[PDB]
Ligand binder design. Structure first.
Ligand SMILES: Nc1ncnc2c1ncn2[C@H]1C[C@H](O)[C@@H](COP(=O)(O)OP(=O)(O)OP(=O)(O)O)O1
Ligand SMILES: Nc1ncnc2c1ncn2[C@H]1C[C@H](O)[C@@H](COP(=O)(O)OP(=O)(O)OP(=O)(O)O)O1
Ligand SMILES: Nc1ncnc2c1ncn2[C@H]1C[C@H](O)[C@@H](COP(=O)(O)OP(=O)(O)OP(=O)(O)O)O1
Ligand SMILES: Nc1ncnc2c1ncn2[C@H]1C[C@H](O)[C@@H](COP(=O)(O)OP(=O)(O)OP(=O)(O)O)O1
Ligand SMILES: Nc1ncnc2c1ncn2[C@H]1C[C@H](O)[C@@H](COP(=O)(O)OP(=O)(O)OP(=O)(O)O)O1
Ligand SMILES: [Mg+2]
Lengths: 647, 101
C-alpha cells in the first residue's frame, strides 16, 4: 500500500487513511446532496492500493480529483478543484504577486491595480470599432490610456506670477502673497506638486529668473531695515539704489556707512543661496517619494543674475554628500544678443552653465535663434518680454504656435498624443520587388492609419471637454489661459481649444531598411525617402488641423513607455529579419542608431533638417571639459537645432 | 438546436459555436499534451443538440464542464474549472457600476 507521505514543507509523516476521508467529506457537505462513507470508502481503498510506498500531498490530491470526476458524482469534483485552486493562490501570495497576474510600496501597488482595472474597460466600452481594431493589431499606441476616463490633460507651463502676487486657495488651504525669497520657492514647489496630481504629464516653470527676481530686492530692503534699527542711522536712500551685482566681498578694512552697505548684500546672498539649495532637495525628494522642468537664462539684472548663479552653484555641489540630482530638469535659454557672445551681458553665467553640464548632467540648451522659435513681438527693453520666449519641458514637448490665439508658450499645454508604428507598415509591404508599387502601397496605408489616428484624437478631445472646472482646482483657476472667467460648475469647452494634439512615430532607420537596402544614416536615397514621408505626414496633419478645427503637430516620442511594446509583437508575427526585428528595441523616432558609428558632426548634419517638421517636440541627444559642451552648443547654433541635451 | 443565448448582462444574441470552439481550445492550449481537433468538434456538436431553444451562458458553461469531465482528456477539465472560478470571483467587483456612472 502506502507507508509514508511527504508534506509540502518537507516533513515525512506516516500514512493516515482518516485524512482523505475527512477531506472528501468536507467537499460532500457543500453540495445539494451529501453522502455517507459508501463511496468515500471505495475511493480511499482505491487510492491506498496502487501506490509507490511514499506519496506527496499534491500527488494524493490529484488522485482524489481524478477519482471524484470519474464516478457518478461530478458535482463534488467541481467543488474540490475550485477550493484547492483558491488555497494554492492563497499560499502563493506570501512571496509573490499573484493578484496582479489574475488581473512594492503600497501606493505603487494601488496605482498598478487602478491602471490594470481601468485599461481594458476603456479599450472596450469607449473606443469606436475602427479605432479599437487599429489598436488591437499593433498599429497605434494611445499614451496614458489608463487615465482616459478621468478627462485629463497632459501638461502646462505655470504662470507663477499670479500665484506669487495674489495667493492661492486650493480646497481648505489658502496662502497669501510672498514677501521674501524663502517663501516664493516654497510656493513654486507647492504649485508644481499640487498640479501634478491633476494631470498625467510633466510640470514646467517658464521664466524662472524673471518671476523670482522681484524677491531678491525685497530681502535686501529687509536686511537694510534691520541693519538701521540697532544703529539709529537713516539709510533710506539705499532702498532703490542700483546695484551692479550681488557679489560677496570680504568685510575687513572698512568702516562707516559704506561698510554696512556690504553686510546687507552678504546676508542677502547667503539667504538666496539657502533658498535655492532647498528648492533642489525638495524637488528631488518629492519625486523620490513628479516631472519638474525649469527654464531660464534670458534676464539681465542684478537679481536675476544672482538667482541664476546661485542655482548654478547649488546644482554643482549636488545633493547630500555630493550625489547628483535627477530632478528638477534644468534648461538654459541662449539667445544671440543676451549671453552668447563674449562681450554680452551674462557671458559668465553661460560659462558657469557650460561648466556645470560637465559634472552634473544639467542644464540642457534651448536655441532661441531657430526659425521656428523666433517671435516678432520681442524687444530687449520690455520688462515682460519673457512672454515671447519659447520654453520646453524635460519630456521633449513644444507648444508655441496657435491658429486662433497668440504665439506664446505660457499657460498652454498638451492635450493628448498618440504614436504610430511604421516598421510594421514597411514589413507588411516588403514582399514586392518593384520599388514604385511598394512605395505607393506604403503611402496608401499610411494615409489610412493617419486618418484613423486623427479620428481617435478628435474623439478623445470630444470626451476631454464636458469636464467641469471644479475637477481641476488649481489648473482651471490660476494656470490656464482663460481660467479666470470660468465658474466652478462650468464646462471647460470654451478654453480647451488652445492645446496641442501630438502624432509621433517610433523608428525610421528600421523602416528604410525594410524599404530600401539601408537606413538614412548610410544612404542618401533613404534619407530623401524618409524626409518625403515625414513631410507627407506633416501635410496630412495640416489638413487634419484645418478640417477638425484643432491643432495637430508631429512629435519625436520620448520612448519611455513604448521602448519595447512594439518589437515583440512583430517578432511573434513576422519572424526574425536581419537588421529590422533582430535587435530587441526599435530605434528612436528619427535619430541615428546607437550601433551605426558616427561622429557628432555627421550625426548633427543628418539629423538637423527634421526639427523643422517635428514642431510637436524634438531632441538632439549626443553621447560622450567645458570645451566639448561649448562645441556642441556651437554646432546647435550653426544649424536649426531646437533642443539639445548633451551630457 | 439552440437559437437564443442570453449573456450575463441579460441581452440576447445568436448561437455562434465558434465561441465554444475557442473556449475549449484556449483551455487545451495550456495543458501538456496539446490540441486535438477531433474532440472540439465532438463536444460542440454534442452541445449544439439536446439543449433548449433559449440557453444562458451559465448553463452552457456547466454543460461543457460536465461533458469535458466524462471524455478522455481530463487534464483540461481542471484548468477550465480553475480559470472559470477565477474569472467568476474577479467579476464580483463593482468596476462596471463605477465605470458607467
Ligand atoms: N497524514 C496523511 N495521510 C494521508 N494523506 C494525507 C495526510 N495528510 C494529508 N494528506 C492528503 C490527503 C488529503 O485529502 C489531503 C488534504 O491534506 P490536509 O489533511 O489538509 O493536510 P495539510 O498538509 O494541508 O495540513 P494542514 O491544513 O493541517 O496544515 O492531503
Ligand atoms: N469548504 C470546502 N469546499 C470544498 N472542498 C473543501 C472545502 N474544505 C476542504 N475541502 C477539500 C479540498 C481541500 O484540499 C481539502 C482539505 O482542506 P484544507 O485543509 O482546507 O485544504 P488545503 O490543504 O488545500 O489548505 P492549506 O494549504 O490552507 O492547508 O478538502
Ligand atoms: N510651506 C508653505 N506652504 C504653504 N504656504 C506657506 C508655506 N510657507 C509659508 N506659506 C504661506 C504663509 C503666508 O500666507 C504666505 C507668505 O508668507 P510670508 O513670506 O511669511 O509672508 P507674510 O504675509 O506672512 O508676511 P509677514 O510675516 O512679514 O507679515 O505663504
Ligand atoms: N454567442 C454565443 N453563442 C453561444 N454561446 C456563447 C456565446 N457567447 C458566449 N457563449 C458561451 C460559450 C462560451 O464558452 C462562454 C464564454 O465565451 P466568451 O464569448 O469568451 O464570453 P464573454 O461573453 O464573457 O466574452 P468577452 O469576455 O469577450 O466579453 O459563453
Ligand atoms: N488559459 C486558459 N485556461 C483555461 N481556460 C481558459 C483559458 N483561456 C480561456 N479559457 C476558458 C474560460 C472561458 O470559458 C473561455 C474564455 O472566456 P474568458 O473571457 O476568458 O472568461 P469568462 O467568460 O469566464 O470571464 P469574463 O467574461 O469575466 O472575463 O475559455
Ligand atoms: Mg545648508
Amino acid at each position: 500500500m502506502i507507508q509514508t507521505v511527504v508534506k509540502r514543507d518537507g516533513r515525512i509523516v506516516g500514512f493516515n487513511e482518516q485524512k482523505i476521508m475527512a477531506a472528501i467529506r468536507k467537499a460532500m457537505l457543500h453540495t445539494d446532496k451529501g453522502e455517507d462513507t459508501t463511496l468515500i470508502e471505495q475511493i480511499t481503498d482505491h487510492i491506498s492500493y496502487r501506490g509507490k510506498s511514499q506519496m506527496s500531498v499534491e500527488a494524493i490530491q490529484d488522485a482524489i480529483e481524478m477519482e471524484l470526476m470519474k464516478s457518478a458524482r461530478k458535482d463534488v469534483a467541481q467543488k474540490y478543484i475550485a477550493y484547492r485552486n483558491q488555497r494554492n493562490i492563497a499560499r502563493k501570495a506570501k512571496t509573490r504577486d499573484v493578484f496582479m497576474s489574475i488581473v512594492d510600496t503600497p501606493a505603487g501597488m494601488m496605482m498598478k491595480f487602478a491602471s490594470e482595472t481601468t485599461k481594458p474597460f476603456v479599450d472596450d466600452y469607449l473606443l469606436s470599432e475602427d479605432v479599437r481594431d487599429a489598436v488591437m493589431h499593433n498599429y497605434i499606441h494611445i499614451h496614458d490610456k489608463d487615465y482616459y476616463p478621468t478627462k485629463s490633460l497632459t501638461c502646462v507651463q505655470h504662470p507663477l506670477d499670479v500665484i506669487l502676487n495674489h495667493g492661492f486657495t486650493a480646497g481648505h488651504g489658502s496662502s497669501r502673497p510672498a514677501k521674501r525669497i524663502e517663501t516664493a520657492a516654497v510656493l513654486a514647489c507647492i504649485s508644481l506638486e499640487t498640479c501634478q496630481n491633476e494631470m498625467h504629464g510633466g510640470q514646467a516653470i517658464p521664466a524662472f529668473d524673471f518671476y523670482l527676481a522681484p524677491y531678491v530686492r525685497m530681502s535686501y530692503q529687509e536686511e537694510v531695515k534691520n541693519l538701521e534699527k540697532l544703529t539709529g542711522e537713516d539709510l533710506s536712500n539705499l532702498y532703490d539704489a542700483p546695484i551692479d551685482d550681488y557679489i560677496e566681498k570680504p568685510l575687513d578694512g572698512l568702516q562707516g556707512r559704506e561698510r554696512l552697505e556690504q553686510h546687507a548684500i552678504n546676508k542677502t546672498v547667503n539667504r538666496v543661496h539657502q533658498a535655492m539649495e532647498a528648492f533642489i532637495h525638495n524637488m528631488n525628494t518629492i519625486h523620490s517619494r513628479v516631472f519638474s522642468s525649469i527654464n531660464y537664462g534670458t534676464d539681465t539684472s542684478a537679481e536675476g543674475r544672482c538667482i541664476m548663479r546661485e542655482i548654478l552653484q547649488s546644482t554643482y555641489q549636488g545633493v547630500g554628500n555630493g550625489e547628483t540630482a535627477i530632478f528638477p530638469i534644468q534648461i538654459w535659454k541662449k539667445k544671440r544678443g543676451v549671453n552668447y557672445l563674449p562681450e554680452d551681458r551674462n557671458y559668465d553665467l553661460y560659462k558657469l552653465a557650460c561648466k556645470v553640464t560637465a559634472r552634473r548632467f544639467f542644464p540642457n540648451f534651448l536655441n532661441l535663434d531657430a526659425t521656428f522659435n523666433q517671435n516678432e513681438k520681442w524687444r530687449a527693453d520690455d520688462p515682460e518680454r519673457y512672454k515671447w520666449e519659447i520654453a520646453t519641458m524635460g519630456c521633449r514637448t513644444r507648444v508655441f504656435e496657435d491658429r486662433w490665439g497668440e504665439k506664446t508658450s505660457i499657460a498652454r499645454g498638451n492635450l493628448s498624443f498618440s504614436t504610430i508604428n511604421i516598421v510594421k507598415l514597411a514589413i507588411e509591404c516588403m514582399g514586392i520587388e518593384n520599388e514604385k508599387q511598394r512605395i505607393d502601397m506604403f503611402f496608401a496605408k499610411l494615409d489610412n492609419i493617419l486618418d484613423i489616428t486623427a479620428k481617435q484624437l478628435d474623439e478623445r478631445f470630444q470626451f476631454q471637454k464636458t469636464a467641469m472646472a471644479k475637477q481641476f482646482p488649481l489648473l482651471m483657476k490660476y494656470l490656464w489661459v482663460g481660467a479666470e472667467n470660468l465658474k466652478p460648475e462650468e464646462t471647460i469647452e470654451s478654453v480647451i481649444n488652445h492645446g496641442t494634439l501630438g502624432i509621433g512615430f517610433i523608428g525610421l532607420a528600421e523602416c528604410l531598411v525594410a524599404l530600401i537596402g539601408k537606413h538614412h544614416g548610410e544612404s542618401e536615397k533613404a534619407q530623401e525617402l524618409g524626409l518625403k514621408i515625414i513631410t507627407y505626414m506633416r501635410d496630412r496633419a495640416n489638413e487634419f488641423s484645418e478640417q477638425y478645427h484643432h491643432n495637430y503637430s508631429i512629435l519625436a516620442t520620448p520612448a519611455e513607455g513604448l521602448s519595447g511594446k512594439f518589437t515583440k509583437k512583430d517578432r511573434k508575427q513576422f519572424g526574425v529579419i536581419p537588421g529590422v526585428t533582430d535587435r530587441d528595441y526599435y530605434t528612436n523616432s528619427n535619430h541615428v542608431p546607437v550601433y551605426y558609428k558616427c561622429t557628432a558632426l555627421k550625426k548633427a548634419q543628418i539629423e538637423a533638417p527634421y526639427h523643422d517638421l517635428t514642431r510637436g517636440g524634438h531632441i538632439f541627444y549626443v553621447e560622450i571639459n567645458p570645451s566639448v559642451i561649448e562645441s556642441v552648443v556651437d554646432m546647435m547654433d550653426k544649424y536649426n537645432m531646437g533642443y539639445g541635451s548633451v551630457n
